[PDB]
Amino acid sequence: DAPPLTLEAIKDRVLYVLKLYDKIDPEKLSVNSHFMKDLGLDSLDQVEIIMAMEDEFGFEIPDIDAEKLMCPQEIVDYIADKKDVYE
Amino acid sequence: SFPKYKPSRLATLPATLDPAEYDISPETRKAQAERLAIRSRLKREYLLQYNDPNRLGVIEDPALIRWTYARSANIYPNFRPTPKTSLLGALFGIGPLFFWYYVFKTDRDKKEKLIQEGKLDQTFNISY
Amino acid sequence: MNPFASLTLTTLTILTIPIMMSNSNIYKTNLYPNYVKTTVSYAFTLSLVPLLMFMHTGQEMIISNWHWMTLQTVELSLSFKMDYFSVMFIPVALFVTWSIMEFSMWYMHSDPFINRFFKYLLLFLITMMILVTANNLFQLFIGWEGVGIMSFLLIGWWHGRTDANTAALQAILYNRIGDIGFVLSMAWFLTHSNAWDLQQIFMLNNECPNMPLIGLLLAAAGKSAQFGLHPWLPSAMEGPTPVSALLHSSTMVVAGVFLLIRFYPLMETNKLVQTMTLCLGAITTLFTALCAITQNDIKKIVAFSTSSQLGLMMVTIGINQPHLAFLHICMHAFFKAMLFMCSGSIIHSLNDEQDIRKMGGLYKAMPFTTTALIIGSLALTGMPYLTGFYSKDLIIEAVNMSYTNAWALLMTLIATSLTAAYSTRIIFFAFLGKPRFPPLVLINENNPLLINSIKRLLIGSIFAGFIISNNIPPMTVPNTTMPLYMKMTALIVTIMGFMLALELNNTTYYLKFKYPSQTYKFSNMLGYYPSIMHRLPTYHNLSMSQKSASSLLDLIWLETILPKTTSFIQMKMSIMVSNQKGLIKLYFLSFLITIMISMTLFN
Amino acid sequence: AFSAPAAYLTHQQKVLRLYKRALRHLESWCVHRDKYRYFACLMRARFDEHKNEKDMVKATQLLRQAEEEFWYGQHPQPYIFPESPGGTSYERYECYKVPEWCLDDWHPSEKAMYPDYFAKREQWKRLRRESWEREVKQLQEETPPGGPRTEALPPARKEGDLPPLWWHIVTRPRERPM
Amino acid sequence: QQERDPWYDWDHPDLRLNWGEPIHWDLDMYIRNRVDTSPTPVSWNTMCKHLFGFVAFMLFMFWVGEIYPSYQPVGPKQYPYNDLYLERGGDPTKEPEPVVHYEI
Amino acid sequence: SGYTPDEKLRLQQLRELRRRWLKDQELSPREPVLPPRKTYRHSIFAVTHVLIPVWIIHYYLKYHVTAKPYTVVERKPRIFPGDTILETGEVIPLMKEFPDQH
Amino acid sequence: MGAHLARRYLGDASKEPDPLRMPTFPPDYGFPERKEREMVATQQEMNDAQLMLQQRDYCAHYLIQLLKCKRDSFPNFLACKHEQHDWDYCEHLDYVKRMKEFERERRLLQRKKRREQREAEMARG
Amino acid sequence: PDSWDKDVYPEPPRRTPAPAPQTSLPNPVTYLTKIFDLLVDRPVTLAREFIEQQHAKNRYYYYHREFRRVPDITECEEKDILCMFEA
């Protein structure tokens, strides 16, 4: 019924959420932008980003895996792997 | 400040409210590491067997075998007629029998006495 | 002859027909759901015909076609009672089932076993028809157990869900307590009347006693989920939405009320059982409404509303008004099925989301669903000229003007107010306000199947109570004279509930946060009944089953008394006998002792 | 679920999990988005106020008090995502998940109904059977003499190898198998 | 097993068990289809007290309402022919005690 | 925490293998190879499914069920004052003259 | 519901009537000439019409007329409004007669209380 | 059929009131009765006529077994097995 997800759509949506975040400069934001190394965030900000992704995609990321997603590309890979997206 | 949560048998204490979860000694970390090591060893053995391509059948579980053996075939050899066991067995095996015997005997005696006195409504009772 | 019995039996037979065709390529293909829906619609028309026949001359018949077996002086035969209740409930059930089947054609489109789902729905319908048309206690029990086990199968539709499995088992347990009551009633009736059929039961039981009527009441409470045995109905929402719409709320949970209606002569004869029925219904409706007003799952809210309506029906039976209960059964079937269909449409549109805290903006997002749900909630609360007006208003008026329990009357009024309150909660948290669902908007309700099914159940939520109430003969004396403040009691309490619920819902927009109250925690946690009564008795029974019966008695003491003690005694005696050293001096001395004993102590 | 657990949760992990739980329960209480944003900002203000604390004993005491406050003030019926454990759609499709070992019990006619799929399946089976010895050798080379100390598996060091114990992870059933 | 962690990668995801680990003596009782000991938002004693108080209060008020019933300021319903003596099954041979109703 | 290099590399390799597995799980255009082996619909449905059961049941009731006593019992029709009994050509008389109540 | 419940339960239950035991006084007590109620429909007519035993009250003839009207004009169920109104008015008159009986019992009980209190006062002094 | 004894199975005479309509609307019950007679009753009557014609081609009879009266247990002597069996 619902249209299937794709890698490009997942990347677009996660970058959309990150660009809507007010503590991230959209011009310096890319899929390889580390949240703490080159974006200057901290643990609480990373937790809030993970929660925003959970709200965006309508599913919960366990805390054991959420503490390791430090890149938009990593978030995309996790979502695609969980949703069984291969294209 | 806030009302305290009182744990029970069926309402066990949550892990975030356990006082021992915040008083950690270096020995506790060693115990946790040992537990993790044991779990990892068991997991590695199971995963090797599970991912073996030539395996065709059921991976026998020694823990399951021990549980089934202990619950069924290991009870009597480890039984000693202590006063507790004697009293509990006598109660739970005899008391209900005499209770039901007394109840049914009283009921049937009352019914028989009513029938003999001829004051029991037995009309339309032609199927017994 | 007469086209009455022939057409009733023909409706039953054509209902049974597609089950036989389940072993064919029609069942193997994807036309089976449409085939079943067409069969149900044809059955609905062919059942409408005898309803027209009854409303003209009031014709009632019983058909005893097949003789099963004669137990000496008791004859059990396949008998059908095509009276007013049967000929009025069959078309309503068929109409609701037709609408639910179309809704399920739309809804369970991606399910690999949609054919099996429709087969199970048809089997449930057949069992319900058997229960309704049964003329004797044995056939009634057959229908009872058939609908129970079909409910068990359909609640656990997703076999991989532990919650679904435990919900199905819990429903079976409560229905089995009800069956205990039913079997008590059957045994008493056979023993004291030599009959299992209603005609001879009514002929011989001029003053029905407490034991059989309490058995019937217990069976009805178990089936209709009254207080004490209620929690299975809210937990039965683990199944697919079509199952909740058709089976539980509409047609299955009214089985206990229907059973109590069928024995209304005996209920009239007794008084204590009437009082107990009234009290049970009052406490049930009050408790279920109070739990409903604070739930966040829409299916659970509708389930608790159904339980409250069942409690109201039980109250109506307790005040000696059997026919008003039947009228309420029909109207409630209509608008409750429509409400469940609307909730299912909302859930499907929002990607299997069943939380009003995530629903929002649906007033303009989903126009037709919003209209249908508003009409259903107006009918549920007793809008002065909808389907719910011709039953609930009369029920409230009859409760007011009766020699009943004051506490029961007060609880009934409070339950009506709480009904308005939770209807307001559903509407406010589901349709008004701003969206709270995920940004990807997949809302689409333009499916002809969904639209047509909701539309058919929507015309019946406006123009059905009027027709039904104007086309039935008067079976009760009306309450023409009453005070003005009592004539509009239902409207006043309904408006009070509306206003209070709306105020408390508007207070949620304020930027103020406070911790919950004891009353809120009690109401949201379902009164703590599921926790205590599902943890303590189960733990104690499962503990005594292992500690006492299995280990202590079977594995230890039953082994110790007969076989182990005898074996030990024999082993000790064998050791004593055979422990001889083979010394001729010793056993010749034993020979001498034996000789002396035989010579002296033997005369 | 995809990550091997550690022996214990550090203080940072404990406070982050408490923060996420508190935010989720606050969202459950604060249904509307603006109210939730206001109170979530207040909650993060509290966390940032307590963020800088050199005394670990005092930090642990604050964490314990915060956990007690959360347990007292938690939502009795918190929001749960439908597919998450405890959700209304949790484990719904577990009955539709059928494995490839069931798939290889098919009849020859059924297999002939799908000719192209089973050629690739045979290729996958050969690939699995040609790597098991290398996988077990790599696993036994990298383990400490006592045994594994964690549930983390090594990757494939060589170009022609595959990460050991990959078959079931790769060939697990789809989340919507039917 | 309900108390056990749901997000861990168990060897038996439905039972939430690992291969080789010791099995509780009462696993048959503590499966997710049976007795649950998971923590509750409200203490067990408080829940029991509230439930018992609610049911006891309801029973007491039902008894109070039974001994103080509600009715309407009307007389008994009047029926003809000796309060329908023959219609309710009275013996035709015997003559019932007359019941006479007067206008008012 | 974060991804160690070993964990990241293993995850990358597993993702590659899983995506290739799913791509293989796709089907071919030819893949399902089957063996070689409405007024009309509603009319053919109405004759059998409705007309045959009603014929069978009417035949069973009129000649077998009603061949035995008391198998089919009908509640007697309600007789009102001022009526005509059709069986015997009888006339059931009217009631008294109602006193007007306004 | 009503003030009578409050009077009986929070006042003088002796002066308030008992619904399950009334009437207590003789029907002719205070009525020099009282007319027995008249029943129009006969027992045989009610039996043939198969009225329910609760419906076989003194208003049964209007119910019989309503049933005959409804049966004759079957397809047009919006027909017997006049018969329905006549039956409702007859039931209303029966109910107001019951209310008159209740009020008579109430004030007879209070008159008895006044008389016995006056007698007690006379006996005392 | 009425192949049973009316005295053994009594049935009061059936009084059916004559139809006296008071409205101009047609009777759907009457129309449906006509349709039922045209579509069902006539075909089943024809089928039954054919079947009964076939039955009358070869007509055979069965009898009700009559049992003689024998002396009863009151007249039977003690330990008289044959008389006891008959009784």
Ligand SMILES: CCCCCCCCCCCCCCCCCC(=O)OC[C@H](COP(=O)([O-])OCC(O)COP(=O)([O-])OC[C@@H](COC(=O)CCCCCCCCCCCCCCCCC)OC(=O)CCCCCCCCCCCCCCCCC)OC(=O)CCCCCCCCCCCCCCCCC
């Ligand atoms: C052992 C006891 C046994 C009792 C048996 C008898 C039971 C009787 C029940 C009576 C009715 C109960 C109503 C619901 C109570 C629960 C409310 C709730 O949970 O709301 C949350 C829920 C919303 O929750 P949420 O949106 O998720 O957010 C929750 C908040 O975050 C956080 O929520 P919150 O907690 O902040 O909000 C709750 C708050 C606000 O809610 C209310 O105030 C609800 C009641 C509204 C007022 C009702 C009375 C006023 C109107 C009638 C006045 C008299 C009229 C007389 C004449 C009538 C005829 C003309 O209420 C309270 O704090 C206390 C309420 C006490 C109610 C009385 C019964 C329980 C007493 C228990 C003892 C302890 C009490 C203190 C609390 C615990 C300790 C701290 O509220 C609703 O959905 C609406 C609730 C109100 C509906 C009212 C409908 C009408 C009620 C009947 C009116 C009269 C009708 C006619 C009667 C017959 C006349 C002849």
Ligand SMILES: CCCCCCCCCCCCCCCCCC(=O)OC[C@H](COP(=O)([O-])OCC[N+](C)(C)C)OC(=O)CCCCCCCCCCCCCCCCC
């Ligand atoms: C006489 C000719 C009339 C004109 C032509 C009519 C159409 C042509 C066919 C002949 C129809 C004859 C009249 C029939 C009734 C028509 C409707 C009517 O009068 O309604 C009155 C009433 C409506 O009257 P009312 O009460 O609303 O009128 C109120 C009037 N005012 C407001 C002015 C006071 O409706 C009904 O009775 C409802 C009928 C429902 C029928 C449901 C479908 C039945 C399907 C049966 C299928 C199976 C058939 C075969 C069975 C045997 C087995 C094979």
Ligand SMILES: CCCCCCCC/C=C/CCCCCCCC(=O)OC[C@H](COP(=O)(O)OCCN)OC(=O)CCCCCCC/C=C/CCCCCCCC
């Ligand atoms: C006389 C016959 C016995 C009468 C009842 C006596 C007590 C019954 C003993 C029950 C034995 C327990 C067997 C255990 C089977 C498995 C239990 C089980 O599956 O778990 C509990 C299971 C499901 O757990 P959940 O709450 O759904 O948790 C889900 C979490 N996601 O719940 C149950 O089924 C237990 C219900 C036990 C019923 C006890 C309450 C019945 C007492 C009320 C009787 C009074 C009725 C009043 C009406 C009177 C009318 C005149």
Ligand SMILES: CCCCCCCC/C=C\CCCCCCCC(=O)OC[C@H](COP(=O)(O)OCCN)OC(=O)CCCCCCC/C=C/CCCCCCCC
């Ligand atoms: C005394 C007067 C009152 C007597 C009682 C009157 C009850 C009236 C009930 C409805 C009237 C009968 C309508 C007949 C509908 C069945 C016709 C049928 O079989 O299908 C035709 C047709 C199309 O069906 P599909 O599923 O789309 O098939 C498409 C094929 N390609 O059916 C329809 O949809 C007609 C639309 C129905 C309009 C909505 C009617 C709502 C009725 C509400 C009240 C009905 C309650 C049921 C009985 C009430 C009394 C207990």
Ligand SMILES: CCCCCCCC/C=C\CCCCCCCC(=O)O[C@H](COC(=O)CCCCCCC/C=C/CCCCCCCC)COP(=O)(O)OCCN
């Ligand atoms: C006045 C109201 C009574 C209400 C009853 C409520 C239920 C309480 C009764 C049953 C509870 C269990 C009592 C019997 C079980 C024995 C207790 C026991 O095991 O004690 C032993 C030691 O044995 C004793 O102490 C014996 C004391 C009790 C003896 C009672 C009198 C003996 C009765 C003789 C009759 C036995 C047969 C009864 C059935 C016969 C057929 C009816 C050791 O206990 P521990 O678990 O190790 O320590 C726990 C400390 N809290």
Ligand SMILES: *P(=O)(O)OCC(C)(C)[C@H](O)C(=O)NCCC(=O)NCCSC(=O)CCCCCCCCCCCCC
């Ligand atoms: P990130 O990696 O940048 O690092 C942040 C952390 C917090 C890990 C720090 O590095 C750190 O460890 N700092 C010192 C330790 C510390 O801050 N301890 C105290 C923090 S916990 C605390 O203060 C919480 C108190 C407020 C929140 C209480 C929650 C109660 C509300 C429950 C409501 C539920 C329903 C509404």
